[PDB]
Amino acid sequence: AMRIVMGSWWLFTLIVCSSYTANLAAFLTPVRTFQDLSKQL
């Protein structure tokens, strides 16, 4: 009833935070590379 409430709508946002958290993780993505100026560093 009201005892069932505590972690529930807590998870209605914490997992959403976690979804945004794991979301961003890769969004900026002899032979080592392909361009000569990229070799310069």
Partner: peptide
Amino acid sequence: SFAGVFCILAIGLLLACLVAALELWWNSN
């Protein structure tokens, strides 16, 4: 990569132990 990340993780334990003592005292009476 995790500074205010685990803040809410402890906040849920706060409201947990809060209502854990609260309804227990309301119902053991």
